[PDB]
């Protein structure tokens, strides 16, 4: 299953609300300690 229940329990007393409007942001980069041992390949271009 790829099925998932709702993130928050919706009720007749909380349905009308502002959802903070989250921002996409940027992903966290691996530390230097991690990178020194990670094999990283360059992608070919066309």
């Amino acid at each position: 299953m790829a099925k998932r229940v709702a993130e928050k329990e919706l009720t007749d007393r909380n349905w009308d609300e502002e959802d903070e409007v989250e921002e996409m942001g940027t992903f966290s980069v691996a530390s230097e300690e991690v990178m020194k041992n990670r094999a990283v390949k360059k992608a070919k271009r066309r």
Binding site: A2, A6, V21, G25, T26, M35, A43
Partner: protein, 424 residues
């Protein structure tokens, strides 16, 4: 301007008139908006007197007066309510449901609803004492429209309270007795009744697939689907959540919402100005694309893929996360032709744009989506053209950059895509 002592000496006397007058003075004091002596009459030990008067079938006015006085106390804090329950009010109120006097019956309906609304414990007590049958009797009329709106609303609200809460959720057999009447209510034309009934269904479907099965077996879907297209936000919201909860269930249960024509309403739900609706509708779609190929096929047939592509592209981030799930579920269970169609709808670009987000989980979802799409391209020997689409829109740079993602799994999936479709 009576005092509690005045009420006591009148209530405890053998003078019938003094008892009624004292009971009415009590009710009036408890109604006061600015500082009502709830605690004072409770400490005065009046609850037991009121409960006893509920049984005075001979004196209807004192019955009404004490039911109201007991209700005003039940409607208070989650302490004053407990005093009423301990006073034995539950079974007493239940026997008043069949009262010939409507205003007395209603008072009983309201009191029972407030009590069951306190929490799961009181709710089960109201059920255990047999409130359901008498309550359903009051709705067993040929034309529900003949009932006063106010009356009907209190009843629906009360039933909804018997369906609310999950620790634990209502007993299965009790839910089973309530479902048939709930379905009939979904046919009413009063928005308040409809909203409350939909909320009730949303609570009953919020749980194990076994509970969903019962709600579906009782035939609530066709009606919920119709309410999905309601114009009233207070109705659409719970109706959508109820349908959303049902499709978290089995493929068979999910087919029932598809057969009821639910998909035909999504083009509007996915384009609804209210972002909450859009979010809940996309979440609902993700659970439908999580099903069988033939179901994904119906999503296709209803022209819904373009709308999902649309939400993934333009829409709040919270809604885009749900869309990402909807797309990844689709690429995961769909056929090659279904995937080819997805790519044709312009899914690549908006999918890549989200590969720079802080939410690691969304990145993994999108990476698995891209992975599934490349597998379909392999079968068609079109892997190369897919690579160019990805590269040409800046997606390759994002995949390459994720090799520096803090999460190892994200790094591994990026690497793998690189060494398979961007090798050399």
């Amino acid at each position: 301007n009576w005092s509690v002592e005045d009420i006591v000496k009148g209530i405890n006397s053998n003078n019938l008139e003094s008892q009624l007058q004292a009971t009415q003075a009590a009710r009036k004091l408890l109604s006061r908006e600015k500082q009502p002596p709830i605690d004072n009459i409770i400490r005065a030990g009046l609850i037991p007197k009121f409960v006893s008067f509920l049984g005075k079938t001979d004196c209807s006015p004192i019955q009404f007066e004490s039911a109201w006085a007991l209700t005003n106390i039940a409607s208070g804090t989650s302490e004053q309510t407990k005093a009423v329950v301990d006073g034995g009010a539950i079974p007493a109120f239940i026997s008043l449901l069949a009262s010939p006097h409507a205003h007395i019956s209603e008072q009983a309906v309201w009191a029972l609803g407030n009590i069951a609304g306190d929490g799961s414990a009181f709710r089960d007590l109201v059920i255990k004492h047999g409130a359901i049958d008498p309550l359903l009797a009051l709705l067993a009329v040929p034309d529900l429209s003949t009932l006063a709106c106010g009356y009907l609303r209190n009843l629906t609200w009360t039933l909804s309270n018997l369906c609310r809460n999950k620790n634990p959720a209502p007993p299965l057999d009790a839910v089973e007795q309530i479902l048939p009447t709930l379905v009939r209510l979904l046919h009413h034309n009063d928005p308040e009744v409809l909203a409350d009934s939909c909320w009730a269904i949303s609570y009953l479907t919020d749980g194990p697939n076994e509970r969903i099965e019962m709600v579906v077996k009782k035939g609530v879907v066709p009606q919920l689907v119709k309410l999905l297209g309601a114009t009233e936000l207070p109705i659409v919201t719970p109706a959508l959540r109820a349908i959303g909860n049902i499709v978290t269930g089995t493929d068979e249960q999910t087919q029932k919402v598809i057969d009821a024509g639910a998909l035909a309403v999504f083009p509007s739900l996915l384009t609804n100005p209210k972002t909450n609706i859009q979010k809940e509708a996309t979440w609902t779609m993700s659970n439908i694309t999580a099903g069988r190929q033939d179901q994904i096929q119906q999503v296709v047939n209803h022209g819904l893929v373009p709308f999902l592509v649309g939400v993934l592209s333009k829409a709040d981030f919270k809604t885009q996360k749900e869309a990402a799930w909807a797309i990844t579920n689709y690429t995961s269970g769909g056929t090659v032709e279904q995937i080819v169609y997805l790519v044709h709808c312009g899914i690549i670009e908006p999918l890549m744009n989200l590969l720079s987000a802080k939410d690691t989980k969304i990145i993994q979802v999108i990476l698995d989506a891209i992975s599934n799409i490349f597998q379909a391209a392999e079968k068609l020997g079109e892997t190369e053209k897919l690579s160019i689409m990805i590269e040409e829109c800046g997606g390759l740079d994002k995949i390459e950059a994720l090799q520096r993602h803090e999460n190892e799994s994200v790094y591994k999936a990026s690497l793998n895509l690189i060494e398979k479709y961007f090798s050399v």
